[PDB]
Design a protein around this nucleic acid. Structure first.
Ligand SMILES: [Ca+2]
Ligand SMILES: [Ca+2]
Ligand SMILES: [Ca+2]
Length: 294
DNA sequence: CGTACACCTGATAATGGAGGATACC
DNA sequence: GGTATCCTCCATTATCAGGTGTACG
């Protein structure tokens, strides 16, 4: 069952807050405006899509998205205003997704008021939409050559509001990795390595830097192929002593929870030093095999 | 012997859309 | 008609998931 701050964290990590402006000559302006809250998970996490649905009052639909993914969506601007806006105004996002939530919100305010059915309000909404995802499409850019994107919200210095935020966030983005690495000097031939790891776009560097002080361990690394950061923990005593305890109280949601549990099992084998024997190494090979699986 | 940070790489589940039909005022 | 919501489908990239090298105790 789902706690408000965990929903916020999860959504900081996995939601999209979208606005669409679609050409259709049946509308007086030539355009139909639509606002959409969307969360898309692999089919193994349908359970979690139904919880969110339940959490948000039984509102919205769950549908097939990709070849093996499902979306939970709320596309009624009325429902978004009554149920989504009051939850996220009270329980705020702290990543750059907040910018998009704020812009998304002004679009709905303008829809509340029918200013979307006017030429000026529509132009406002297109400027807003322009700052939600790196611009407008080719088509909208040309329909609206005159629009200056609404400048993005200055979203300074946001602390982790609650431990459940982090449980939620790691549930969406976050990996409990088990590695077996060739070793020339270990007697059994392989080193058993546990890594805790959060990936995020480099835009969220502040958040990523706050993870170090919040958990009292780890370090940031930049991916050399593009603008993405890793928060990494590889020190095993920080794993045993900080990360495992944290996620024991503040549990991961979705199927990834089964992965945390197996990673914990690997860690117990490591604490006892059984990873240094043939038997323990095989236990670990078998646990690692069933992770990302079932 | 064994560990841990700095560095490396490929695969795909999310990111963030899209369009058509239908329901509703 | 005008407007709002439901439904079905998709290209790319933000992750996610494996490694490796080698200094150091
Ligand atoms: Ca994410
Ligand atoms: Ca965005
Ligand atoms: Ca994710």
């Amino acid at each position: 069952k789902l706690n408000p701050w965990a929903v916020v964290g999860f959504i900081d990590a996995e939601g999209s807050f979208m606005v669409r402006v679609r050409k259709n000559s049946k509308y007086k302006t030539g355009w139909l405006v639509v606002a959409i809250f969307s969360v898309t998970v692999d089919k193994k996490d349908l359970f979690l899509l139904e919880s969110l649905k339940t959490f948000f009052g039984g509102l919205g639909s769950i549908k097939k998205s990709g070849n093996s993914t499902f979306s939970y969506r709320i596309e009624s601007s009325e429902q978004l205003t009554k149920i989504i806006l009051p939850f996220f105004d009270k329980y705020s996002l702290i990543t750059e997704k907040l910018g998009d939530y704020l812009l998304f919100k002004k679009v709905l305010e303008l829809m509340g008021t029918k200013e979307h059915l006017t030429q000026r309000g529509l132009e406002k909404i297109v400027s807003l939409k322009a700052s939600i995802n790196k611009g407008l499409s080719e088509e909208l850019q040309a329909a609206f050559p005159q629009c200056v994107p609404t400048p993005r919200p200055e979203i300074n210095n946001k602390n982790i509001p609650d431990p459940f935020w982090l449980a939620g966030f790691v549930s969406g983005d976050g990996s409990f990795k088990s590695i077996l690495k060739k070793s020339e000097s270990i007697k059994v031939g392989f080193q058993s390595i546990l890594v805790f790891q959060i990936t995020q776009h480099a835009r969220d560097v502040k958040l990523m830097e706050s993870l170090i002080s919040y958990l009292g361990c780890g370090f940031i690394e930049k991916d050399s192929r593009g603008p993405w950061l890793y928060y990494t923990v590889t020190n095993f005593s920080d794993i045993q002593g900080k990360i495992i305890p944290f996620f024991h109280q503040y549990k991961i949601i979705g199927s990834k929870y089964g992965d945390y549990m197996d990673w914990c099992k690997i860690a117990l084998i490591m604490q006892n030093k059984n990873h240094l024997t043939p038997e323990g190494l095989n236990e670990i090979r078998a646990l690692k095999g069933g992770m990302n699986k079932g």
